[PDB]
Design a protein around this ligand. Structure first.
Ligand SMILES: Cc1cc2nc3c(=O)[nH]c(=O)nc-3n(C[C@H](O)[C@H](O)[C@H](O)COP(=O)(O)OP(=O)(O)OC[C@H]3O[C@@H](n4cnc5c(N)ncnc54)[C@H](O)[C@@H]3O)c2cc1C
Length: 433
């Protein structure tokens, strides 16, 4: 009798959930039809803000300001946006069991929820140094950043330790955005990572060299090809230092770690087909279980333009896959045709006064173009990835919305390159024309 049933259940209260709810309201959802179950205590928000505006030392972004869908220029969805529509937000509720055969979800406290259609939007986990048993990685003030709860703990630690020393472990987008956030919050910052350069799975050595030099000039000590092998801590269990493989010690009042993550799909293992580490879906985000969909970070879906199954961690995909799934679900109900998902990979990052965008596929060979001098007033440079005589990928730092739209069009249309050398001479003009 305490069990709750909903025609549609979104599991997770993140970017994809929030955008899926907007498409349900667009599609004409009736009160009582939809529930969003989330372990977070707040309504869906624009997660990229957590490593950006949330950490500003002045005029920081705070909720309710960055709830979905403001991040894409849409309208804000306060908790009241859901309740007025009879869309039930079930917050601070962690689902610990999902039985797809009985369409039942069970919470940690044993509350049960059944559905007709399930949308899996559980996002990604955070890989922790304690997962590998790294010596003293359990020390207090060794922090990770995924959710607003993490962001609040980081904000509190920054206030407690400001004027102090911070070490950032990891050289990916988290490493880069957090090193900058700590520096702008008046910390002595050291960035350490074992790979030969930052954003190792996306940046080329030449792109990374710009960021390493720019960070160095901001006063960030960048230690590439360096491995953190332990941590020192005091009688309170608070971190005091980061030990390096060579034997060096970095003093630290705070340590922030960003070493990637994995699709949070533990609830569904063995119940749905998996591919390339994610839950496999078709062009409509439907899994191997009929009526079960998977969106955002967890989906391994058909990337139409590359004729392959892919998995991404992009806020743009999170928003668009959410809209696709809802359109597909409502399409099956009415028997109306829905086009296959046609996504152009798009990733971006911002730190200090920098901002870059990437579109397409980072395959083939690379060429660098523009002004890549880190001391430039307004640096503006890019890179193209060329394979089989055509541009597959495009990167641009410091572009205007027009220049970013131009490099997106290059990645979308994959124009031929008769002369790669000649493309390097054309640079940013190649995209704009
Ligand atoms: C700090 C940060 C900065 C980022 N910056 C950028 C950026 O600049 N550009 C970019 O393109 N991408 C960025 N990303 C990536 C982007 O935010 C993600 O791709 C996006 O959030 C994916 O949305 P999602 O809905 O799939 O997952 P999430 O937004 O993570 O949503 C998952 C939700 O499900 C909940 N959940 C999970 N398991 C359960 C459970 N068992 N029970 C209940 N609730 C559960 C979670 O608590 C959360 O509410 C960033 C990510 C982070 C963490």
């Amino acid at each position: 009798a305490s069990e709750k049933h909903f025609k549609y259940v979104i599991l997770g209260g993140g970017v994809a959930a929030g955008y899926a709810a907007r498409e349900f309201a667009k599609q004409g959802v009736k009160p009582g039809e939809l529930a969003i179950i989330s372990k977070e205590a707040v309504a869906p928000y624009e997660r990229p803000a957590l490593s950006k505006g949330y950490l500003f030392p002045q005029n920081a972004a705070r909720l309710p300001g960055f709830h979905v869908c403001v991040g894409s220029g849409g309208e804000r969805q306060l908790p009241e946006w859901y309740s007025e529509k009879g869309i039930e937000l079930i917050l601070s509720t962690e689902i610990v069991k999902a039985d797809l055969s009985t369409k039942t979800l069970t919470s940690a406290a044993g509350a049960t929820f059944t559905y007709e259609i399930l949308i899996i939007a559980t996002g990604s986990s955070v890989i922790k140094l304690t997962d590998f048993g790294t010596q003293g990685a359990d020390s207090n003030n060794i922090l990770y950043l995924r959710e607003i709860d993490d962001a609040d703990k980081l904000v509190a630690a920054i206030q407690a330790k400001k004027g102090g020393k911070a070490v950032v472990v990891g050289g990916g987008y988290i490493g880069l955005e957090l090193s900058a956030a700590l520096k702008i919050n008046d910390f002595d910052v050291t960035m350490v990572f074992p790979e030969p350069w930052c954003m190792p799975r996306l940046f080329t050595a030449d792109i990374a060299a710009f960021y390493e030099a720019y960070y160095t000039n901001k006063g960030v000590k960048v230690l590439k090809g360096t491995l953190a092998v332990g941590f020192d801590a005091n009688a309170n269990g608070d971190v005091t230092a980061v030990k390096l493989k060579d034997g060096k010690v970095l003093e630290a009042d705070i340590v922030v770690v960003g070493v990637g993550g994995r699709p949070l799909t533990t609830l569904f293992k063995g119940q749905v087909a998996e591919e390339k580490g994610g839950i496999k879906t078709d062009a409509f985000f439907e899994t191997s279980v009929p009526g079960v969909y998977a969106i955002g970070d967890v989906a391994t879906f058909p990337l139409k333009m590359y004729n392959e199954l892919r998995r991404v961690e992009h806020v743009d995909h999170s928003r668009k896959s959410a809209e696709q799934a809802v359109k597909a679900i409502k399409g099956k109900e009415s028997g109306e045709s829905v086009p296959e998902y046609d996504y152009l990979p798009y990733f971006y990052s911002r730190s200090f006064d920098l901002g870059w965008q990437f579109y397409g596929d980072n395959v083939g060979e690379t060429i660098l173009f523009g002004d890549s001098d880190p001391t430039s007033s307004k640096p503006k440079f890019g890179s193209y990835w060329i394979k089989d005589g055509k541009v597959f990928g495009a990167f641009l730092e410091g572009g205007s919305p027009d220049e970013n739209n131009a490099i997106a069009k290059v990645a979308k249309t994959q124009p031929p390159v008769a002369s790669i050398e000649e493309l390097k001479k054309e640079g940013l003009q190649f995209a704009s024309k």
